[PDB]
Amino acid sequence: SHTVKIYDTCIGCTQCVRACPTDVLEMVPWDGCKANQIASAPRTEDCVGCKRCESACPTDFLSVRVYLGSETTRSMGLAY
Amino acid sequence: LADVNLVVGGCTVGALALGRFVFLPFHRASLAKAGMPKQNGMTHLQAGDARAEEASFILKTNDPAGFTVVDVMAWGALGHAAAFYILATSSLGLDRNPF
Amino acid sequence: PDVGPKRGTQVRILRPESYWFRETGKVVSVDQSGIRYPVVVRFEKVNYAGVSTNNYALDEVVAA
Amino acid sequence: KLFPKFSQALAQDPTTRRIWFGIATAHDFESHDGMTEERLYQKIFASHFGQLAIIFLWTSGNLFHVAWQGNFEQWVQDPLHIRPIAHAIWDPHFGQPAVEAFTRGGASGPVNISTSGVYQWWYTIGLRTNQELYTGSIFLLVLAALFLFAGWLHLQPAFQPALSWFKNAESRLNHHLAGLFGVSSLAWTGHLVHVAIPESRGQHVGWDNFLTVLPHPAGLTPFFTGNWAAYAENPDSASHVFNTAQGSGTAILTFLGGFHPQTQSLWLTDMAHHHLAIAVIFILAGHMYRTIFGIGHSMREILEAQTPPSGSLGAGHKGLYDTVNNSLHFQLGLALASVGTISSLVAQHMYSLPPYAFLAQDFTTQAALYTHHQYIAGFIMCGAFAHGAIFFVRDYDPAQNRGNVLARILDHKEALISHLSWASLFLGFHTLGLYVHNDVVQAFGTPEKQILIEPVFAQWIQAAHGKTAYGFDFLLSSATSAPSLAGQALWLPGWLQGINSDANSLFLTIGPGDFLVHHAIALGLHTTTLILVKGALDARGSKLMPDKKDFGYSFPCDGPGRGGTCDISAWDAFYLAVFWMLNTIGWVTFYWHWKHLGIWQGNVNQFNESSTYLMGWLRDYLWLNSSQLINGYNPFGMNSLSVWAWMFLFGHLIYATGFMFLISWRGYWQELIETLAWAHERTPLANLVRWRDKPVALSIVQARLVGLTHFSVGYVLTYAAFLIASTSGKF
Amino acid sequence: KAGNWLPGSETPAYLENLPASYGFDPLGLAAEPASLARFRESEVFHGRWAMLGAAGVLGVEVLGYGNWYDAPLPLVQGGQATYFGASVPFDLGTLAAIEFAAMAGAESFRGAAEPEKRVYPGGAFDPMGMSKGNSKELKTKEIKNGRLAMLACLGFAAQHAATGASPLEALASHLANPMAVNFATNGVSLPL
Amino acid sequence: MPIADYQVFTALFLALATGIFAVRLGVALYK
Amino acid sequence: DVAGLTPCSESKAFAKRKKNEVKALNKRLKNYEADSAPALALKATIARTEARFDKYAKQGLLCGTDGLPHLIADPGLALRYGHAGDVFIPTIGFIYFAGWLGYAGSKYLQAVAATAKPIEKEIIIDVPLAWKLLWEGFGWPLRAFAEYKNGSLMEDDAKITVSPR
Amino acid sequence: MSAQFLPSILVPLVGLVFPAVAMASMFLYIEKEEI
């Protein structure tokens, strides 16, 4: 239950969506960049908070931005 | 150290006359510039502190120059403080002079 | 006609949230399509992520 | 799973975190769900009532225990040859030898010897018997009950005050300056004159006969006739015996200065006159602001006119009134800064100018009181800066505070941080370098190659106060100068007599060792301030995290990206600065303790020669003075200092434990706990018991808090044990 | 302007139309208009008070009635200060009170007036009708004499605080042998 | 003259009453 | 005397310390043939100690209650008492040498910044250029004051990057 | 001192009875599930 947002500085490089290990980020058609694609975070219920997505964004400042918040079993990464 | 009566009475009457005749224009000008205190742009009364409502016995007086009773009390307090400074200091008999 | 700064000129960054705020960089291209940020600027010095190329708009890329 | 009633986010947590964070966020009302400004202010007001009830109950408990289990009546007769008793000990683990070893100050059973100095205070203010202590305890118990009832009363919608009542700052300042400060000290003067002064001269004045005793033989006529000097006619003789009537005198408002020869404390008439002057001044100051009577000041207009021309300050203080008034963390930081600095003031004055009878005579009490108030002040200063950081993260509005001194000081924060960095680097480099140089040249058997700078500036200031030891002959040390001629008939006789005598702590002599230690103190203050100021200013955002205010005051990190962002929040700046505050206050207390331990034994030379190199500190202070402390219990028995030896090792254990949380981080522990969870769900006879909360390792910020709390508690306990056992052992 | 205190130099532009202006403002204390207006009023009033003060300090000594420093001493440690050789039957308390009342009245009337009438109020303060015939020149003379008298009063204070003499006594002492009893010979002004 | 037993008992009883006031205020704050 | 400190050449404790330290070294001597390498080393050490104690007494350093030299860190109160070699003169000497090294480094940075690979000329120093600038750094007071009076020493903050407040 | 028996009763109350009861009540309340 972390709040993942994607801002318009995105250039659609697909790095953030290959980085994510839990499939929270996705590519959708867009038009505000040359690649004509932007990222989106529909499955944000699955966000663990690893910030691998945020560590792969080349834009300055970062386009994918994670805000850790409420903790659930999915967010806390509990196998037991 | 010569008559509490004369010094305190003369000092208080002089201070009253000095705050009614001499310092009153500047006092009123500064009071008009300052005005009632405001929080976030509104007086404490508008914000909801109905105890910050201005006392009614000062808004309208009968002194032709607007000298209210609270002004009288402030100026009399200053006069008594100065008079008792005079008394208590003249009562001492020690060399404070740095010479 | 061509829009924005010329290719190869030096510009001063004016985005307050950028690593190179108030520092100079050379334009390597300006896209003409209609992107929000078409100006592409190259700096000598890298940022914390190790990159040196960034895209800026046109109101925040004062030349010279 | 509904314990955190105030936080729905934490209630739904399926783990043990819900408990931990559910405790640590119980008082942050602004973060609670469904919270309005009105409700916040009302809840805060009631919490303050609860706090005063706690304080009154604590002081009533002290009084009751001294009256019940203490030897106050015995201590009054022989204030110098009796050890004040705190409370009795009832512990069923004690062996017989410990019961033997803890029966001390004449009591029938094992007891604790008080190091709080409350005996001296109550003795000085007029309390002589235990019935008076019991009466005070009962009165304070009732008073705490009354404050509790008021706190409940004002939580009620019939009596709940509106929010605009709380923000009324002019009326609150008027009443706190004139009423809470002025009239309270006026009444303290009334007590001193009516009770403490006559009880200091053998006469008994109590509730029974205070209306039949004249505090002055010509009562109230000099006061109303202006003949005020008649209240300082014959003061206390230099041969006065406290508590008795041997050369007592009739003056009630004297201004002698200096010390009482027997008690080695301030004259009581001096303090009575002090509080009279303070009362008059504070009442006058309390008539400054405007309420509802059409006179006074509007603080907003004062702030709006403190804008210098030429625009050196920018918009001046435009918008500071609303900024302070609206933000409760700004007010809390200001109050904490003031209270902490005043705690340091209390510590620094009460040893050089002891105010209580037969204080300073007792040595463990002096050290205990000084170290206590110094540590309290250090913690309060860290809190003031933490709440400044919280103000910036939470309640700072750039649009309202645009162009005022707050915006201008945020504008050039890099200058501030870089110059604090330079000052701290300089002080550290050079103080360490001089210490190491002295230490090496001493190690090679040539102590004459030592760099021993003389503190000529501090020695010069000491000489300006009348200390005729450095031959400066400057201001008050020149019996011919204007300040000397002015005070030579009022206060200067006693003051100069006290300052020029080496029998007290009033302005100790200082050499090169004092120079080195003061520069160590300067390094500590500057580095602690660097950490705190940097974390307060670099709290709305850095170059590394330009949107930090979007995350709040406390958060773990920002992932391992951009090189790594551990300890990036402002809370982590407070965390890192707590260590430096501990270290700096430790230096201050080490310096004070060694200086005075040399003073009290007459051996000033040990400090004056051994304090210029660090092995002198390690050997002639820590190692030498720890002999009696660590010998409290040993295979040959134990003595009264066994409790302090156990506490010494206990503090060592706590501090060493805190390193575990400080060094190891959440990630080894999570896997370890998770293997343990596999072990428990999976073993016979224990599958019948399952956890209601999923056991998870402590969070990152929580673990930092836990390690820091252990560190601080261990630090405090270890030094307190060493101090008490090293001072009470020798004296 | 007429003058330039540092001949080869450039003067601030806000100091031109003012009477007795020399461009003397190396600290930029008049960079703002309202500040400069207040400073101009204060300079003129200070000049007047210091002319009166310097005239008094010189005229109590040239007339022969003690120096300015020892004039208030007799009022303390005794009483009845002397004027022209006479003796006022007033103590320090009544002197302070009467001065406070009179000065309060006078300077409260002055302070409540218009900006220009706070510094150059002819009216009844120019009985000899001299403000006419272009007072600009007269204002310059007043300002320059005031500057000289202000510097003289500060000189009285400092010379008495350093050598402990009296104005005419210091004058005579310096005149007797200037090359060896100037300010460079006392042990105060020069820390040598 | 040490304080008598009845004084100790009166003090303890009044402390119990004060504790009752305290618990009332505490539950008011929890609300 | 400047603050209750008698000159070490007068202080009895200073001479007593001299005596005791020399006596310790003599006791160490009384174990070797006065012609062996250890004996020569001990004799040289004693000569060095005596020279140091005489040198300190000659220069008029101030000794305290104990026999240890003290220093004065106030210009004026050290210049009118003949003790400017304690802190003021070494202050000048340091400030000069520190400024020399700092100015040499600063000018080397500004000289290699305007090259092809400035990040390369910091890990592989150009020794002739470094040595030339190290020689030019000796006049650093002159050149630095020239650049301050010129305004070319410093940079206006409108061009230095800052954090987002 | 007076009432020598009183500590022997009050100390176990506050160091054993009160802590156990308070901890039991607190652990029941934090797990009350519906307050």
Ligand code: CLA
């Ligand atoms: C005469 C009127 C009056 C008085 C007496 C008080 C008194 C008090 N108010 Mg209050 N208040 C008032 C008017 C008044 N108020 C008005 C008109 C308003 C509306 C504008 C408010 C609004 C208000 C609020 C919102 C709050 C208070 C609070 C408090 C309490 C302050 C906390 C405290 O006890 O520390 C006491 C402080 C001192 C005694 C001064 C200490 C001086 C320094 C720190 C130390 C110096 C002393 C000395 C060196 C120490 C040596 C002693 C040692 C030997 C033991 C206090 C009892 C707070 C509170 O606690 O809630 C109950 C609080 O929240 N007031």
Ligand code: CLA
């Ligand atoms: C607020 C503290 C306080 C209180 C409650 C008292 C109370 C008392 N004093 Mg005392 N006193 C005090 C402070 C105080 N005093 C101080 C600070 C000093 C000087 C250091 C003295 C010196 C003193 C002397 C020398 C004598 C007393 C005496 C007395 C008793 C006779 C009543 C009286 O004085 O005549 C009545 C008072 C008046 C007619 C005028 C007083 C009104 C004043 C000027 C203004 C009141 C405003 C004030 C700020 C209100 C504060 C509120 C506060 C009381 C809660 C009385 C029980 C006399 C006595 O008989 O001993 C038993 C006695 O001779 N006092």
Ligand code: CLA
């Ligand atoms: C008038 C004093 C005062 C007040 C009213 C507040 C009020 C507040 N502070 Mg604060 N603070 C203060 C002083 C004060 N502080 C000081 C002096 C410091 C320096 C240490 C701090 C540092 C500080 C920080 C870093 C933070 C706050 C926060 C807060 C807010 C929430 C508090 C909370 O989370 O509760 C919870 C209370 C606890 C978790 C208690 C923790 C346990 C303590 C620290 C140690 C226990 C060990 C124990 C003593 C050992 C027993 C001894 C024995 C074994 C030997 C709150 C509005 C928080 C905040 O504002 O959120 C942004 C925040 O993060 N404060």
Ligand code: CLA
């Ligand atoms: C003995 C332990 C220790 C020491 C020596 C220091 C020293 C220092 N701390 Mg630190 N600190 C410590 C513990 C320590 N800390 C702990 C436990 C914490 C909690 C985590 C902190 C948290 C902390 C913070 C948050 C900050 C500091 C800062 C600083 C620097 C302050 C500036 C200064 O004083 O300049 C003096 C310099 C010295 C004393 C270093 C000595 C110089 C060396 C020894 C000379 C080199 C000789 C030789 C060539 C060495 C190499 C030989 C080898 C390679 C063979 C300083 C270097 C502040 C800072 O960064 O400064 C701007 C900073 O903000 N500290």
Ligand code: CLA
């Ligand atoms: C004095 C400081 C201290 C202490 C007490 C501990 C203690 C412990 N560490 Mg630790 N550690 C420390 C410092 C310390 N460490 C530091 C500085 C680091 C950084 C390198 C680490 C890094 C570290 C790692 C990586 C690991 C540990 C582990 C452990 C646990 C191993 C289990 C054990 O030892 O058996 C028993 C525990 C004790 C003997 C502790 C003392 C308790 C007393 C003797 C008995 C308890 C009864 C008590 C007194 C009664 C309760 C009182 C009541 C009021 C509650 C243990 C609790 C390991 C672990 O988690 O388990 C395998 C683990 O892998 N530590």
Ligand code: CLA
């Ligand atoms: C020639 C290079 C150079 C220069 C001109 C400066 C200049 C400055 N530094 Mg800096 N610094 C340097 C190198 C340099 N530094 C290096 C290599 C480091 C990494 C250790 C630092 C780390 C550093 C810190 C942490 C701080 C400064 C600060 C400062 C300022 C305060 C002055 C000071 O005492 O700093 C102190 C100097 C040091 C701590 C170390 C100096 C390093 C050596 C001695 C110099 C390097 C010379 C170079 C290797 C030789 C090249 C010669 C050429 C011929 C090849 C100042 C403007 C302070 C500041 O913030 O400004 C107020 C500050 O806190 N510096």
Ligand code: CLA
């Ligand atoms: C808050 C101050 C305070 C403190 C720290 C102590 C501490 C202590 N008391 Mg004591 N007590 C106090 C106030 C205090 N008391 C007051 C005001 C009274 C008057 C009624 C008493 C009457 C009293 C008696 C008769 C006895 C003790 C005893 C003891 C000792 C054992 C504790 C115990 O089991 O007794 C239990 C204590 C009580 C039953 C009543 C104390 C109630 C206080 C006010 C609690 C206040 C709560 C506190 C402020 C907030 C902390 C949070 C907490 C609720 C979790 C212990 C050292 C016993 C002893 O002598 O041991 C040898 C003993 O028999 N006390």
Ligand SMILES: CC1=C(/C=C/C(C)=C/C=C/C(C)=C/C=C/C=C(C)/C=C/C=C(C)/C=C/C2=C(C)CCCC2(C)C)C(C)(C)CCC1
């Ligand atoms: C962060 C922050 C904050 C906080 C801050 C702080 C905490 C501060 C502080 C600080 C401090 C804590 C300070 C202190 C101070 C003090 C001072 C500065 C002083 C002084 C004094 C003087 C000057 C003196 C004088 C004198 C002398 C010399 C001696 C004798 C007497 C006399 C008086 C004469 C706030 C929120 C607010 C804001 C924002 C953020």
Ligand code: SF4
């Ligand atoms: S190590 Fe811990 S604190 Fe550091 S970046 Fe990784 S998760 Fe954050």
